[PDB]
Ligand binder design. Structure first.
Ligand SMILES: CCCCCC[C@H]1C(=O)O[C@H](C)C/C=C/C=C/C=C/C=C/C=C(\C)[C@@H](O)C[C@H](O)C[C@H](O)C[C@H](O)C[C@H](O)C[C@H](O)C[C@@H]1O
Ligand code: HEM
Length: 397
């Protein structure tokens, strides 16, 4: 039996302790995963990039290595992207990217600022202490993406609850699929509504997009909306609560940011790299024999791109365990790489910049109200983070 992949973190803001020696000795190696299956663990930065850029790997993998039962949940089809291979991944991503453009992400900045300031108004009005996860981290990115999609305000809490029920590694396939099925009911209503009553929203723009092959039908819209809505809710929330917790535990770094809000672009790149919240790694399967880091991977063999390990490779950046927001941004792997690299990463960066800049400006003396060693971290979720973050700040006399 290949050694189990290290999971335990003695420092909750760092990778599992065992990872570094594995990456150093054998950045492509056999390991046993949570499901009990053996597969290839890829931990080295250059090798994860090579893995992710190689189009002979498929995302239609045989096992769910990160769940106990190993059962692969039934994934949505065309429009969802994450679970598609070329050539349909390529054409369908192009259709989505025609309307979900980086310039349109950029044009969300004033709305995202308003949402942030509104949730901080509510925090100041209630006074401290507060749990920043429930009052701010989960709520803000939900409002941003729900506004882009014209999701009625009374349904948004249900979307948030689906991400909490669905994006887990501590349950069986039946539980995960039931939450996926409830999400389909919400997506079906939303697509029907946009078709019936088009508006200034992203589904309505996709409905009218150039579509010579007639691929944009309701199932495609539901699948695209589901992937975008859930990814945008869960990942960004996790980064907000965890990057906040890390800065609140990093006094020299938080002082630099407080001195200079214009460093927040560098700080968000370093937070993404350092926290790499996709903690268990991306799964792929070889569709032909390939050589990866000089190791033969056989057709049909599953492989895990451990982006958290890769972002701590000392060959990628100097002293990678040092959290340093003054570093020049480098091309970390927090959004993946190659064909599947995050289509939403510019919107994610914009949200994080506005969130962290405004948060640390507007709550003077923000600081933890519960020590890190007592927080509940997300070892049980696909995306890492904290389940709660109690904070306090200077009182407004
Ligand atoms: C490189 C390191 C990162 C690895 C990340 C690994 C991480 C990931 O890729 O995250 C994305 C990057 C961001 C998350 C996106 C989430 C998308 C959810 C979309 C859901 C769509 C649902 C509909 C259309 C329903 O109508 C029909 C559908 O068929 C119902 C299914 O049941 C839904 C599945 O349950 C969803 C599945 O559970 C999510 C994966 O589990 C996410 C994965 O685990
Ligand atoms: C900080 C927040 C985010 C992180 C860390 C993140 C991470 C990632 C990663 C690692 C992947 C690639 C998965 C793989 O290769 O298997 C990805 C893909 C994807 N993400 Fe993001 N994501 C974030 C925010 C967003 C947002 C805001 C959106 C939507 C607006 C979004 C939409 C998507 C979609 C649709 C894909 C699939 C792209 C494809 O398969 O071609 N994500 N994300």
């Amino acid at each position: 039996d290949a050694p189990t992949v290290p999971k335990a973190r003695s420092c909750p803001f760092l990778p599992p302790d065992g990872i570094a020696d594995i990456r150093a000795a054998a950045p492509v190696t056999r390991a046993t995963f949570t499901s009990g299956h053996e597969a290839w663990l890829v931990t080295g930065y250059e090798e994860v990039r090579a893995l992710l850029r190689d189009s002979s790997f498929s995302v239609q993998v045989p096992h769910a290595l990160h769940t106990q039962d190993g059962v692969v949940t039934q994934k949505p089809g065309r429009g969802s992207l994450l679970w598609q291979d070329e050539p349909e991944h390529t054409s369908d991503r192009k259709l989505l990217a025609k309307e979900f453009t980086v310039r349109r992400m950029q044009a969300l900045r004033p709305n995202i600022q308003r949402i942030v300031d509104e949730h901080l108004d509510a925090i100041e009005a209630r006074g401290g202490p507060v749990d920043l996860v429930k009052t701010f981290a989960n709520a803000v990115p939900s409002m941003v993406i729900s506004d882009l999609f014209g999701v009625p305000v009374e349904r948004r809490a249900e979307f948030q609850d689906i991400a909490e029920a669905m994006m887990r590694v501590d349950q069986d396939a039946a539980a995960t699929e039931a939450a996926g099925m409830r999400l389909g009911g919400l997506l079906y209503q939303l697509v029907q509504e946009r078709r019936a009553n088009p508006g200034d929203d992203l589904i309505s723009a996709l409905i009218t997009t150039e579509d010579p092959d007639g691929v944009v039908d309701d199932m495609f819209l539901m699948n695209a909306a589901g992937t975008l809505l859930i990814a945008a809710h869960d990942t960004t929330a996790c980064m907000i609560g965890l990057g906040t917790a890390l800065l609140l535990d990093s006094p020299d770094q938080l002082a630099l940011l407080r001195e200079d809000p214009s460093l927040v672009g560098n700080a968000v790149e370093e937070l993404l790299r350092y926290l790499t919240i996709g903690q268990f790694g991306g799964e792929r399967v070889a569709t032909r024999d390939v050589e990866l880091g000089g190791v033969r991977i056989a057709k049909g063999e599953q492989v895990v791109a451990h982006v958290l390990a890769a972002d701590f490779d000392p060959a990628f950046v100097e002293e990678p365990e040092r959290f340093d927001i003054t570093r020049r941004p480098a091309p970390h792997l927090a959004f993946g790489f190659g064909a599947h690299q995050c289509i939403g990463q510019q919107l994610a960066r914009i949200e994080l910049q506005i969130v962290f800049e405004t948060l640390f400006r507007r709550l003077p003396g923000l600081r933890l109200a519960k020590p890190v060693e007592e927080l509940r971290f997300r070892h049980d979720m696909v995306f890492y983070g904290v389940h709660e973050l109690p904070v306090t700040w200077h009182h407004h006399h």
